[PDB]
Amino acid sequence: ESLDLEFESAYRGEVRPPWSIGEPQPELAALIVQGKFRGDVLDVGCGEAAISLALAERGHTTVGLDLSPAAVELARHEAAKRGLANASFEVADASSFTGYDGRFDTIVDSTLFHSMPVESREGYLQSIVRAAAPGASYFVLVFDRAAIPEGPINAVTEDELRAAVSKYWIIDEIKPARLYARFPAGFAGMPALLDIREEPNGLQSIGGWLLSAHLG
Numbered sequence: 001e002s003l004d005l006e007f008e009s010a011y012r013g014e015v016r017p018p019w020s021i022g023e024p025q026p027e028l029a030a031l032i033v034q035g036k037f038r039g040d041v042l043d044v045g046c047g048e049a050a051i052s053l054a055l056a057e058r059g060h061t062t063v064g065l066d067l068s069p070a071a072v073e074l075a076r077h078e079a080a081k082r083g084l085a086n087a088s089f090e091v092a093d094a095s096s097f098t099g100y101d102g103r104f105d106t107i108v109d110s111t112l113f114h115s116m117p118v119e120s121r122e123g124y125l126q127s128i129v130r131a132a133a134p135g136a137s138y139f140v141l142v143f144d145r146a147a148i149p150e151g152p153i154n155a156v157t158e159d160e161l162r163a164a165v166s167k168y169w170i171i172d173e174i175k176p177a178r179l180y181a182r183f184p185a186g187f188a189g190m191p192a193l194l195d196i197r198e199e200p201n202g203l204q205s206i207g208g209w210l211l212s213a214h215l216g
């Protein structure tokens with residue numbers, strides 16, 4: 001299976017993607033304020049790249065990679081509107097990319113993890129480790145399989161995520177997390193087929209996992 005056409009259509013606006021919330025995902029913004037993001041950052045499966053933009057505004061040199069040319073164009077457009085010189089973007093397949101050997105001190109996966117086939121995970125993890133500087137940190141925000149079923153999205157259980165990532169990184173923490181979005185009215189039916197939590201500020205959230213890891 002393949003989500004390439006759906007991601008490109010969502011970014012072109014066929015209304016904006018529900019996950020393009022216009023700010024970094026809150027669970028990842030909390031790690032930034034804790035000082036967990038360091039040096040040159042890779043925002044892998046960056047989408048519109050709100051987290052790249054926030055990190056570039058703080059002084060980091062950032063690179064965002066996405067398979068969708070529309071996402072890369074949107075990220076470049078927003079960085080240009082803000083006059084950021086520090087943020088760059090490229091179209092690439094996270095499961096098979098090169099050209100950044102030992103580059104990044106922090107790699108962040110903001111909901112890319114479940115957006116590729118299960119069979120692509122090993123190529124992706126090999127690609128990002130190859131792109132990592134010594135002592136690099138890695139952060140993943142991903143849907144929980146308890147919340148998102150088998151289907152187009154490859155959400156994970158805690159054990160599955162640990163088994164996949166521990167082969168490549170030293171895992172510091174895996175904890176429950178929320179993935180925020182702005183869904184249209186009536187999203188997923190009435191009654192709803194998914195557990196969508198209503199949040200303040202017109203947002204919603206779905207269950208997930210926040211993983212923190214590093215090289216060492």
Ligand SMILES: Nc1ncnc2c1ncn2[C@@H]1O[C@H](CSCC[C@H](N)C(=O)O)[C@@H](O)[C@H]1O
Nearest residue numbers: 007045046047066067068093094110112115
């Ligand atoms: N193999 C792959 N390589 C790179 N990007 C991919 C990919 N498979 C999916 N993607 C991208 O993964 C992203 C998941 S949506 C999340 C986008 C962004 N990180 C955010 O938090 O808003 C989409 O932009 C999609 O195009």
Ligand SMILES: COn1ccc(=O)c2ccccc21
Nearest residue numbers: 018019111115153179180181
């Ligand atoms: C790629 O998974 N995805 C697809 C449709 C959504 O509306 C959505 C909302 C939040 C996060 C991910 C999402």
Ligand code: NA
Nearest residue numbers: 003115116117
């Ligand atoms: Na994909």
Ligand code: NA
Nearest residue numbers: 175176177178
């Ligand atoms: Na929490």
